[PDB]
């Protein structure tokens, strides 16, 4: 079940980029790898802000030493899709409830 909300190579400019254009609107997303340490991902959610606007915010997924995944110690997940759907029903903490996936 190849997910569209994943995107495998992406750099963290494609991600704001790809967000930020046409068809996505508020709680748009997409996760990829992370930039800073690899083997790990990153959520990138398209946010409604009060200066400029729109704009584009990355969470940080963490790895669990057995094999789980969260943003926040509080809530982990067994795996990237149920921390999708978590966060899909309430923004639980996050900037905004995550929507459609990203649109090319
Ligand atoms: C500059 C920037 O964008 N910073 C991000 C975090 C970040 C993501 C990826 C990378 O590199 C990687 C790359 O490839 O960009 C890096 P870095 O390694 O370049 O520093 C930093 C941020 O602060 N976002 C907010 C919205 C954010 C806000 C709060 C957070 O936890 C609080 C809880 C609160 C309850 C709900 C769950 C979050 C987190 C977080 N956990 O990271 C993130």
Redesign the pocket.
Same mark, same amino acid.
């Given at each position: 079940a190849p997910e569209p909300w994943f995107f495998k190579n992406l750099s963290?400019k494609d991600a704001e980029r790809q967000l930020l254009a046409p068809g996505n609107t508020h709680g748009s997303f997409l996760i990829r790898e !992370?930039? !800073?340490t690899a083997g790990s991902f /990153?959520l990138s959610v398209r946010d409604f802000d009060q200066n400029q606007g729109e704009v584009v &915010?990355?969470? &940080?997924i963490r790895n669990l030493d057995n094999g789980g995944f969260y943003? !926040?110690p509080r809530i982990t997940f067994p795996g990237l899709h149920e921390l999708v759907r978590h966060y899909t029903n309430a923004s639980?903490?996050? /900037?905004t409830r995550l929507s459609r996936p990203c649109q090319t």
């Open positions: 963290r !992370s930039e !800073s /990153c &915010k990355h969470y &940080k943003i !926040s639980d903490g996050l /900037c």
